Design a binder for this molecule. Structure first.
Ligand SMILES: O=C(Cc1ccc(Cl)cc1)N1CCC2(CC1)Oc1ccccc1O2
Ligand SMILES: CCCCCCCCO[C@@H]1O[C@H](CO)[C@@H](O)[C@H](O)[C@H]1O
Ligand SMILES: CCCCCCCCO[C@@H]1O[C@H](CO)[C@@H](O)[C@H](O)[C@H]1O
Ligand SMILES: CCCCCCCCO[C@@H]1O[C@H](CO)[C@@H](O)[C@H](O)[C@H]1O
Ligand SMILES: CCCCCCCCO[C@@H]1O[C@H](CO)[C@@H](O)[C@H](O)[C@H]1O
Ligand SMILES: CCCCCCCCO[C@@H]1O[C@H](CO)[C@@H](O)[C@H](O)[C@H]1O
Ligand SMILES: *C(=O)CCCCCCCCCCCCCCC
Ligand SMILES: CC(=O)N[C@@H]1[C@@H](O)[C@H](O)[C@@H](CO)O[C@H]1O
Ligand SMILES: CC(=O)N[C@@H]1[C@@H](O)[C@H](O)[C@@H](CO)O[C@H]1O
Length: 328
């Protein structure tokens, strides 16, 4: 008796007092004080004011600068579009529902916001995986007579859409489901109930293996071999100071990306290990959704790491903002 069950929800609050209401009908001010709902709204507002300009500016400066429109950058545009799905499909609706105290859009809007907010975050995750594979193929050259062109970059972007749909669509057709999560103002995959009618247990395993373990292994391998190949080639040219300088900056950048991926990855692993063991207590209307609360920020720091620190995008964004010029 941890929470309260309904046909389309699970409110993480005991019902011995008879105060629980459907998160589609009445505010959930027993999960959290009204100011805690407002702080959720403020956090959504922060993500919107930082997420939309950075990600929209990425799409905009690509239009005004021809040198950005290379095939190896196509997957970066896919990342910026994915974050805009998170910004508009997830953060915006949550900011609206949070100020009511409950998900005012009903169960139909729960599937919609759940899908798009999950789709955007899933496109972003696999865009990072695809970019790691692309950089690995271009640098380590595992195929003897291979050149990465426009057709290959399109496959990689289209591949992210298949992977993201592979995660976001099954809950719409009966494998897992979309329910209000945490404070019941946004919607997402049901990791909180063992809903046997939709086989939630198998979907969590599938999510954990395919959309959690596999992305980590691919990123670590590709960048691992990449830094290995770069350091190996740089060792053969120790007389070139720029080669050593290029090797040092490639190492620092791969580290930054791998660390940034783990900052979004480890919270789920920490919640996993606490759910893997300790399977005997109620997770409050918050605990299990703490990784989600911080994984949203990937809509802000991923374009900062992968785009704003790209040498090309930075100068072009300065040029666009710058008007025309820029300090040289
Ligand atoms: O939705 C995503 C997609 C994603 C993928 C990578 C990152 Cl870095 C962030 C989000 N998550 C991952 C897999 C998932 C669900 C949440 O399954 C779990 C089962 C047990 C414990 C934690 C779990 O996390
Ligand atoms: C983008 C900003 C949107 C803000 C929408 C706020 C809508 C508030 O709506 C109000 O909410 C109260 C508590 O939920 C109710 O008691 C009121 O009846 C209702 O009018
Ligand atoms: C940039 C901010 C634009 C805000 C436009 C939001 C329009 C909603 O407007 C709000 O809707 C609520 C519905 O319950 C009403 O209770 C409020 O009185 C009304 O102001
Ligand atoms: C100190 C930071 C603690 C963060 C705890 C977040 C617990 C609530 O979790 C949040 O619930 C919202 C309701 O729709 C939504 C957000 O996606 C979710 O992260
Ligand atoms: C750096 C890694 C980028 C991957 C970001 C994936 C973010 C997806 O995060 C997911 O968002 C959903 C919608 O709010 C929620 O239902 C899930 O609980 C949450 O895990
Ligand atoms: C995908 C995993 C990322 C691999 C990052 C490897 C970080 C290595 O970093 C390098 O290691 C050298 C010793 O091996 C040090 O001497 C160098 O200072 C350092 O640049
Ligand atoms: C050359 O690049 C000309 C740029 C002209 C604009 C420079 C000033 C930008 C100010 C951005 C900071 C806005 C802060 C708003 C916070 C809500
Ligand atoms: C979501 C839900 O069922 N909430 C119930 C509600 O039906 C009722 O007003 C009260 C008394 O039983 O307990 C709570
Ligand atoms: C005090 C309270 O909330 N009572 C409710 C009652 O109004 C409602 O008809 C019923 C639903 O079956 O649940 C209980």
């Amino acid at each position: 008796m941890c929470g309260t069950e309904g046909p389309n929800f699970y409110v993480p609050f005991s019902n011995k007092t008879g105060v629980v209401r459907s998160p589609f009908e009445a505010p959930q001010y027993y999960l959290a004080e009204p100011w805690q709902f407002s702080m959720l709204a403020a956090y959504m507002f922060l993500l919107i004011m930082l997420g939309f300009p950075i990600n929209f500016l990425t799409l905009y400066v690509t239009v005004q600068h021809k040198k950005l429109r290379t095939p190896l950058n196509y997957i970066l545009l896919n990342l910026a579009v994915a974050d805009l799905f998170m910004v508009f499909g997830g953060f915006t609706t949550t900011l609206y529902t949070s100020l009511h105290g409950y998900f005012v859009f009903g169960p139909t809007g729960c599937n919609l916001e759940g899908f798009f907010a999950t789709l955007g975050g899933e496109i972003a995750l696999w865009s990072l995986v695809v970019l790691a594979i692309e950089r690995y193929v271009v640098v380590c050259k595992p195929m003897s007579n291979f050149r990465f062109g426009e057709n290959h970059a399109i496959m990689g972007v289209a591949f992210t859409w298949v992977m993201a749909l592979a995660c976001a669509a099954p809950p719409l057709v009966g494998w897992s489901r979309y329910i209000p999560e945490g404070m019941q103002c946004s919607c997402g995959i049901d990791y909180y109930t063992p809903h046997e009618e939709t086989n939630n247990e198998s979907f969590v395993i599938y999510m954990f293996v395919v959309h959690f373990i596999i992305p980590l292994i691919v990123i670590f391998f590709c960048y691992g071999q990449l830094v290995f190949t770069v350091k190996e080639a740089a060792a053969q040219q120790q007389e070139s100071a720029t080669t050593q300088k290029a090797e040092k900056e490639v190492t620092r950048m791969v580290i930054i990306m791998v660390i940034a991926f783990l900052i979004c990855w480890l919270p789920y692993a920490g919640v996993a290990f606490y759910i893997f063991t300790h399977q005997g207590s109620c997770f409050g209307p918050i605990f299990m959704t703490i990784p989600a609360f911080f994984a949203k920020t990937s809509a802000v720091y991923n374009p900062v790491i992968y785009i704003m620190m790209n040498k090309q995008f930075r100068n072009c964004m300065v040029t666009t903002l710058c008007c025309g010029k820029n300090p040289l």
